[PDB]
Design a protein around this nucleic acid. Structure first.
Ligand code: UDP
Ligand code: CL
Ligand code: MN
Ligand code: MN
Length: 553
RNA sequence: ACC
């Protein structure tokens, strides 16, 4: 039995000055009017979060768990992984990664400066030689943007981010980067959710649904997952990494990282003051995503067995889970789900919201998204991935000296291209703004899973065809759920309604077309929905030539 | 902060 955290009373402090909202939002004040509703989480609310994630865990495992873990270790044993060289690990450091306390930053790391390389040499040697001394961490509040929600308390408190010095972060990669690239896929196979594009995720869920004689589905998410992860879960994570075939030196670093960093340690705020002690997942270590996903998978698969879920097909992404299985009748389904939740709760993975069984695929939300349905160019049902557009619209209106929301618009257009809210609202706004700026042909960054991809706005039609298919330009007759949710979100943020967007889009389309070239292709393909007499849209040659593999894997 |  253990407390997730203990605290000294020292504040969780900010890094520098927190971003200020301005009196005019010139890029987004034609998108929506209720800018008062759009806020960024700050260190100010960090103490409120701290309180909500500090609690006593008392975990109890059973034979279901023991049996699943056994099978996972076995599957792990088929993996061979290597150390990264110090230098390879250095080059995987993101360009703005928070600098070391020891006199260098990401720039020096990525260029293999001598002082940075030498410091990292001594960090690595010290990991091989001291398997015990706790490694210090910094605790920080995440800054992210949401729309106020009266129901859910108004403003969400900032999540807590916990990470070690840059020098240690490089070492983590040396020991574990290769494992992060191989282990989840080896132990989960098709259940590993991170490997799928939106269309592929959709295809997978539909496939799973059609395979059952009488399907039932549900989603699950753990409340404050990192805080629920126990010291023992983390040692079990090690035992799973150690089941791979590894060179001896990696075994030793992995063990030291586990005991000195991953299982816990002292936390300092940005001012250097002792803040607390952690006995749970540090979100910010290399193993955050792999560890979350695997430990979620272990618990959830064991809980399925404990609950009597028949013929489970799982999709797991971090602490986000969908299970599609054979219905045993709604009465047993409901009982089985309570047993599932009970087992997860024993396993120290308690729910934010209790799960419930569903028998219609539209009604299952996971990873903030859900499958919906519309009609394609030949009048066939077409399934696609959508989500509540509230957060995307709020982020679309985050505009400060330090931050442009244009990249946000782009990321949503790519990921959610077939949706009614992207097609009618975000595409219309994006193209209008860039045209008026005369920056249509300037490349933008599309950010995904921490990676960044340079995209030209005028290549979107090819990109969208490749990622979502040509159907993405002719979806119509969207679902009641989706029409309702979109209209409501637009009202809530003070944006024009869909019919006004349709009028704006007509004019955006005509302006694009009038420019000829790739712009006119954007107009014809991306806004064929806006005109009375549809055009016949044919496969784009450039789309065949595209390889977008890495974007969603 | 990590993916
Ligand atoms: O910016 C983020 C968001 C989430 N997570 C990790 O993913 C887990 C699940 O996140 P979720 O969105 O379900 O929120 P939580 O379960 O933390 O309340 C977290 O506990 C973190 O370990 C993270 O590392 N960074
Ligand atoms: Cl069709
Ligand atoms: Mn969660
Ligand atoms: Mn989650």
């Amino acid at each position: 039995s253990s407390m997730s955290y203990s605290w000294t009373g020292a504040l969780i402090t900010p890094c520098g000055p927190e971003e200020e909202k301005l009196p005019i939002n010139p890029l987004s004040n034609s998108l929506l009017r209720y800018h008062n509703k759009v806020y960024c989480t700050t260190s100010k609310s960090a103490s409120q979060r701290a309180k909500k994630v500090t609690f006593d865990r008392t975990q109890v495992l059973d034979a279901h768990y023991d049996s699943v873990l056994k099978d996972i270790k076995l599957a792990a044993s088929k993996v061979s992984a290597r150390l990264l060289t110090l230098q390879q690990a250095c080059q995987l450091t993101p360009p703005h990664s928070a600098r070391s306390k020891y006199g260098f930053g990401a720039k020096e790391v990525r260029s293999l400066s001598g002082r940075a390389v030498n410091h990292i040499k001594s960090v690595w040697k010290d990991l091989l030689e001291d398997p015990q001394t706790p490694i210090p961490t910094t605790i920080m509040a995440k800054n992210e943007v949401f729309c106020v929600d009266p129901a859910k308390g108004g403003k969400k408190p900032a999540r807590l981010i916990v990470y070690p010095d840059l020098g240690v972060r490089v070492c983590e990669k040396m020991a574990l980067y290769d494992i992060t690239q191989k282990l989840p896929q080896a132990v989960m196979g098709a259940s590993y959710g991170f490997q799928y594009s939106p269309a592929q995720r959709v295809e997978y869920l539909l496939k799973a649904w059609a395979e059952k004689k009488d399907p039932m589905g549900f989603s699950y998410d753990t409340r404050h997952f990192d805080s629920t992860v126990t010291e023992r879960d983390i040692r079990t994570e090690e035992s799973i990494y150690q089941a791979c075939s590894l060179p001896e030196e990696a075994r030793t670093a992995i063990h030291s990282l586990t005991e000195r960093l991953y299982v816990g340690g002292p936390m300092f705020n940005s001012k250097g003051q002792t803040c607390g002690y952690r006995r749970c997942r540090a979100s910010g270590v290399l193993t955050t995503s792999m560890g979350n996903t695997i430990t979620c998978y272990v618990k959830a698969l064991a809980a399925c067995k404990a609950a009597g879920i028949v013929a489970p097909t799982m999709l797991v992404c971090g602490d986000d889970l969908i299970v599609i299985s054979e219905s045993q009748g709604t009465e047993e389904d409901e009982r089985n789900l309570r047993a599932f939740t009970e087992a997860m709760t024993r396993y120290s993975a308690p729910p934010g919201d209790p799960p419930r069984p569903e028998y219609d695929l539209e009604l299952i939300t996971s990873c903030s998204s859900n499958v919906s349905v519309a009609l394609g160019p030949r009048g066939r049902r077409r399934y696609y991935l959508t989500r509540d557009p509230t957060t995307p619209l709020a982020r679309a209106a985050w505009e400060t000296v330090r931050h442009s929301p244009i990249n946000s618009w782009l990321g949503n257009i790519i990921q959610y291209a077939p949706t009614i809210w992207v097609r009618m609202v975000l595409m219309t706004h994006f193209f209008s703004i860039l045209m008026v700026q005369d920056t249509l042909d300037q490349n933008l960054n599309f950010e995904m899973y921490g990676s960044v991809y340079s995209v030209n706005p005028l290549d979107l039609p090819a990109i969208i065809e490749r990622l979502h298919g040509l159907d993405a330009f002719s979806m119509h007759t969207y679902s009641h759920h989706e029409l309702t949710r979109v209209a409501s979100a637009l009202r809530k943020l003070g944006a024009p309604p869909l019919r006004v967007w349709k009028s704006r889009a007509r004019a955006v389309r005509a302006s694009l077309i009038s420019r000829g070239g790739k712009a006119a292709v954007c107009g014809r393909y991306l806004f064929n929905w806006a005109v009375k007499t549809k055009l016949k849209l044919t496969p784009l040659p450039e789309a065949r030539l595209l390889d977008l593999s890495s974007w969603f894997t």
